[PDB]
DNA sequence: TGTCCCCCGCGTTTTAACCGCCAAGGGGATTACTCCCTAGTCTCCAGGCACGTGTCAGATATATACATCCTGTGCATGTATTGAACAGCGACGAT
């Protein structure tokens, strides 16, 4: 085999999930623009 | 384009909003009654407006002084360049 190669040795063969900032904000925009429920609390306002 | 930081998102902790139910009296709604106040009417006239007029406060034209806005000189200083005056090394002749 290559153990007998004395010159010109043949070397061929051997060796949680986070959302991006701004996404939840936009989703909140979509959520409250569809609804009409009051946003400010009732008792602190009173 | 480049930096630094100011919110965004998310888990955990803290608070009071919200609902359900009862208890109570403050005040608004409603009625009945009376009279004081305002619409309506008439007569009377001066307060308010049109019209006319007279003139001075203000617009216009023209001359001058004040302000300012910007560019072009100067200055000054640093730097670059160049000339000159120190410095070889060696061959020669005079001593």
């Amino acid at each position: 085999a290559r153990t007998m190669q004395t010159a010109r040795k043949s070397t061929g063969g051997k060796a949680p999930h986070r959302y991006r900032p701004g996404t939840v904000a936009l989703r909140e925009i979509r959520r409250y623009q569809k609804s009409t429920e009051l946003l400010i609390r009732k008792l602190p306002f009173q």
Side-chain angles (χ1 to χ4, degrees):
Chain A
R2 298 170 190 171
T3 62
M4 290 296 292
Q5 284 183 352
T6 65
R8 297 294 182 92
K9 297 178 184 179
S10 65
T11 61
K14 298 287 100 175
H17 65 92
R18 297 176 184 175
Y19 292 0
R20 304 179 75 187
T23 303
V24 179
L26 291 169
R27 194 167 67 245
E28 294 183 357
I29 294 170
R30 301 183 191 274
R31 187 264 192 88
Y32 299 63
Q33 283 179 352
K34 288 180 172 65
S35 66
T36 63
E37 294 178 354
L38 296 176
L39 303 182
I40 305 168
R41 333 209 277 271
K42 296 181 180 180
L43 292 177
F45 188 79
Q46 204 188 20

